[PDB]
Each structure stands twice: as C-alpha cells, then as structure tokens.
C-alpha cells in the first residue's frame, strides 16, 4: 500500500522537475514535501516493526494513506489533462498545482503532529486553546479523526451555523487536507487561527467570510505576486494562513518605500493587528480596495 504511494509520489516528483514550470524553492515546495513525506512514512514504519498489526488498524493512518494516494493521483491526473497549460503562470491548471502543493504541506504537518517521532499520539494530542480542548473532549473523547457531518453537527450545537452555504465555507476553511474528515490537528489549527472560542464563528465570519483581505489557500509567492499590482498603493494588504507556521497568520502589505513585506502577528489577536495596522497606515486597502472593513 505504502509502496504504491511512493511510486505515485515518485512520478509527481519527476513531473514537477520539468524546467518549464520554473518552480521556485519556496514553501510549499513539492520537490521537498514528497521526499519528506516519504521520509516520515519511513520513520513511522520503522517504529512499528513487528507490530504492523497495530499500525494497520489505526483509523487516522488509514484515512491519511487513502488521501495521500488520492492526492498524488489527482496531481498526476492534473498534469495529464493540463499538458502545456501547466507551464502558463496564471492558468487554472497551474493554480490547481499550487493549491495541491499547499495541501501536501498541510498533510505532512498533520502527519507530524499526529505521529511525532513516528509513534501514534493522536489520542493524547494536546489542543492548544483550553476552551477548544473541552469541546473536542466532550464531543469526541480521544478520537483523532471524525467525519465532516459528524463534526458539523457537534459544532452546530455549540456555535450555530447559519446556513448550508456557510457550512460549506467553514468546511473548506477547516478541512486543510481536503479529505472530508476533520482531525484533532485540523481542529487545533482552526481554533488557534479563529480564537477566542467563545465567539469562534463570528470571528471566522468577520476575518474570512466577509473580509476582502483574506486569501484562502494562497502561498507566500502568490501573496507577493498578487500585491505587485498595488505596488504604487502603499497600505494595500492581504492575509492568509502561514504554511510553514500552521496556526499563525501571515499578513502581506505594500510599504510607502515600495517594498512588499509579510509579517506574522504575535502577542495580539489578528483583529488587533488589523485594527492597529489600519490605525497606523500599514493595513489600509484590503486586496487594494478603497474601503476597509470595520472590525471594531
């Protein structure tokens, strides 16, 4: 099973080595992520020598390998169908490859979070936000992974979701590995990004649903490329999930001096960074728009 995945991963790698892609060495970097995924899968198999029995029963790991196989096939398939439009920056097939790369990066983060040192620890996973942890313990016990419907319904009982369309927006924000399951790890990331728990969904609504600045599934280089058109418009800014520091925010903005910087706010909630940054002239024009949301 794992042997079949490696051969698929191998092909994506050969596919992504094509010079016409001009792929930058910059996270998420598919040429690193697949070998590193392999290496971490090698590590887990090493820690389960003999007891492959136990590993094979593990629910999370089964979901993970299945998604890994699905994702690599989808990638191979995407190159097949896209042919030379893969090399055209700004093409849809190319954008799909970027987003896959991000999904691979999220998958590896999660696998490392659940198997640190290669040994399964999903059942003693320490959720960061105390209120979030209480919700997950009470609804799912020591479960590592739950189906989406299941997650949706439990969450809805504490934080009502307004509508089907909103539920689907929420699912695509939280489901980083795009596998219709929520992991305790995916859960931890979401509740870190959108804390405080007490107003979770309002927070996510204000920062992501109705915010023109928010950029789902965008990478560092995409933020850089996107803000270039606003290079003469200091104060133009957008923000997104950091890919290398999953659970923290990355705000990109155009400075008065013509630089494009990206920063990770610490020691203050994203709300406060945005309010302060508006107040001080750094974060004025979300995606270059003249009107900035009022987050007060």
């Amino acid at each position: 099973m794992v042997e079949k995945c490696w051969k698929l991963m191998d092909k994506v790698v050969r596919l992504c080595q094509n010079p016409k892609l001009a792929l930058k060495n910059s996270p998420p970097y598919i040429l690193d992520l697949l070998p590193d995924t392999y290496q971490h899968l090698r590590t887990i198999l090493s820690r389960y020598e003999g007891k492959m029995e136990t590993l094979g029963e593990n629910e999370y790991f089964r979901v993970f390998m299945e998604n890994l196989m699905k994702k690599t096939k989808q990638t191979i398939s995407l190159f097949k169908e896209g042919k030379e439009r893969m090399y055209e920056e700004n093409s849809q097939p190319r954008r799909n490859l970027t987003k896959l790369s991000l999904i691979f990066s999220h998958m590896l983060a999660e696998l490392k979070g659940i198997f640190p040192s290669g040994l399964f620890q999903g059942d003693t996973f320490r959720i960061t936000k105390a209120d979030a942890a209480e919700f997950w313990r009470k609804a799912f016990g020591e479960k590592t992974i739950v189906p989406w419907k299941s997650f949706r319904q439990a969450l809805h009982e504490v934080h009502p979701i307004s509508s089907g369309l909103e539920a689907m927006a929420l699912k695509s924000t939280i489901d980083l590995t795009c596998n219709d399951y929520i992991s305790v790890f995916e859960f931890d990331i979401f509740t870190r990004l959108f804390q405080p728990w007490s107003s979770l969904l309002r927070n996510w609504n204000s920062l992501a649903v109705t915010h023109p600045g928010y950029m789902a599934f965008l990478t560092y280089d995409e933020v850089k490329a996107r803000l270039q058109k606003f290079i003469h418009k200091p104060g133009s800014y957008i923000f997104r999930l950091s890919c290398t520091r999953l659970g923290q925010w990355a705000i990109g903005y155009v400075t008065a001096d013509g630089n494009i910087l990206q920063t990770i706010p610490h020691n203050k909630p994203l709300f406060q960074a945005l309010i302060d940054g508006f107040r001080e002239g750094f974060y004025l024009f979300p995606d270059g728009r003249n009107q900035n949301p009022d987050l007060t």
Binding site: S26, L261, T263, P265, A273, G277, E280
Partner: peptide, 11 residues
C-alpha cells in the same frame, strides 16, 4: 539559502 521571508510586526 538565506532569502526574504517574514519580517517583524510593524504595528
């Protein structure tokens, strides 16, 4: 090797 990435909070 070394390359521009994240920069300290301006706010």
């Amino acid at each position: 090797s070394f390359l521009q990435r994240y920069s300290s909070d301006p706010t």
